[PDB]
Structure 1
Amino acid sequence: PKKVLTGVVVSDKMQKTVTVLVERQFPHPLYGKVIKRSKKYLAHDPEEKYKLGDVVEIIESRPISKRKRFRVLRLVESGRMDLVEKYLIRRQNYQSLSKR
């Protein structure tokens, strides 16, 4: 069963590619409470249809670019920046906390 993940487009700067934020949930291997973790997959859009802030289903595909082995399945829920915003503010925060 080729894997399927549901996530969100966060990046749309690339060519025919979209970065998808995929959230996963699970009990901590020892402490027990539900930890929420995530990963970004570089999906693949041929006809450049998928747009930022769209939730999509990812499916395991034939290797494409170095680190781009997934095609996008179908659009789940369109228009929902809400989530992006988070990813974004988190990224921005990164600018802080350093030795520059």
Structure 2
Amino acid sequence: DIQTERAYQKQPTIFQNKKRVKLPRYYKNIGLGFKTPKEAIEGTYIDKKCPFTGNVSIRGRILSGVVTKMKMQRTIVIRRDYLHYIRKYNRFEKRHKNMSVHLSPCFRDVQIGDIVTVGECRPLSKTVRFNVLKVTKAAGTKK
């Protein structure tokens, strides 16, 4: 149930037409003390915009946020919340800068209001320069 587009979608590393008589999944590590989920190994999904099963480099700044929108496909919109101290009036002001982050299809069961880790990468599109590393669930919601 893959390749709904017109062209042929595949991974450029694997080869499936050698002289024989299930295809093995190709993946690589991201580093920086992280692991891979079991569904990413067991699945058969293909996406070139993926740190493990694809070609993109995660480097630079590592930030965090929260997921608030899942309307657009293969991407999510996050929103940062932080404060700042003013030296003239010794009080705090509110700041927020939203941005769009590409969403890897291995993260299947993801709901809104969960903490997401974003990582800086090369620009794949106009306003997306970040990928998803890990998603942690909020308070409760065991079901």
Q: Work out the number of aligned pairs and report it.
A: 80
Structure 2: runs of 5 or more not aligned = 1-58
Give the counterpart letter for 1:38 in structure 2. H
The structure 1 segments of at least 4 consecutive aligned residues displaced by more than 4 Å after TM superposition are none
User: Which structure has greater helix proportion?
Assistant: 1
Alpha-carbon shift at residue 79 of structure 1 (Å): 6.3
TM-score normalized by structure 1? 0.66
- Structure 1: where are the runs of 5+ without partners? 81-100
Two-structure CA RMSD over aligned residues (Å): 2.2
Partner SS for 1:25:
strand
Give percent identity, aligned residues only. Answer: 31
Q: 1:67 to 1:73 in 2, by over 3 A?
A: same
Tell me how far 1:56 sits from its aligned partner. 0.7
CA pair 34-77 structure 1, distance change in 2 beyond 3 A: farther
1:59 equivalenced with 2:119 (yes/no): yes
Q: Which amino acid is 2:134 matched to?
A: R
Which structure has the larger Rg?
2
TM-score, scaled relative to structure 2: 0.49
Residue 19, structure 1, aligned to residue 77, structure 2: yes
